[PDB]
Design a protein around this ligand. Structure first.
Ligand SMILES: [Cl-]
Ligand SMILES: [Cl-]
Length: 121
């Protein structure tokens, strides 16, 4: 009525991304750092034989800038893809797997809030 829904969605998107990227633990360290960039090519070619659709916060960031995310669900799709790769490639007891579960939970809780409100916090 006083906004275009199309525009608010990019604001919601940028908030969801920021919440992941800047997520901190109890100490105050940044849980998402290992997801800032894809693993080296070619120092872990193992990873690329195994992970068919690699994605990290680098590529997500660029997609967001270029308004590729038409809905919050698309962004959540790519963030989930990133978490599920790390969960496929690492074992349940690794620290990084456990950091993914928390991140993913924080991510999904944030997306659910944003969609409930249909507005940024
Ligand atoms: Cl509208
Ligand atoms: Cl790290």
């Amino acid at each position: 009525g006083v906004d275009l829904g199309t525009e608010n969605l990019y604001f919601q998107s940028m908030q969801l991304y920021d919440t992941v990227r800047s997520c901190r633990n109890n100490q105050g360290q940044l849980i998402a750092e290992p997801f800032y960039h894809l693993p080296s090519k070619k120092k872990y070619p193992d990873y690329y034989q195994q992970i068919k659709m690699p994605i990290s916060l680098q590529q997500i960031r660029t997609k967001l800038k270029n308004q590729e995310y038409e809905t919050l669900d698309h962004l959540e799709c790519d963030l989930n893809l990133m978490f599920e790769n790390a969960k496929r490639y690492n074992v349940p007891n690794s620290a990084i797997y456990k950091r993914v579960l928390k991140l993913q939970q924080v991510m999904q809780a944030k997306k659910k809030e944003l969609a409930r409100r249909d507005d940024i916090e």
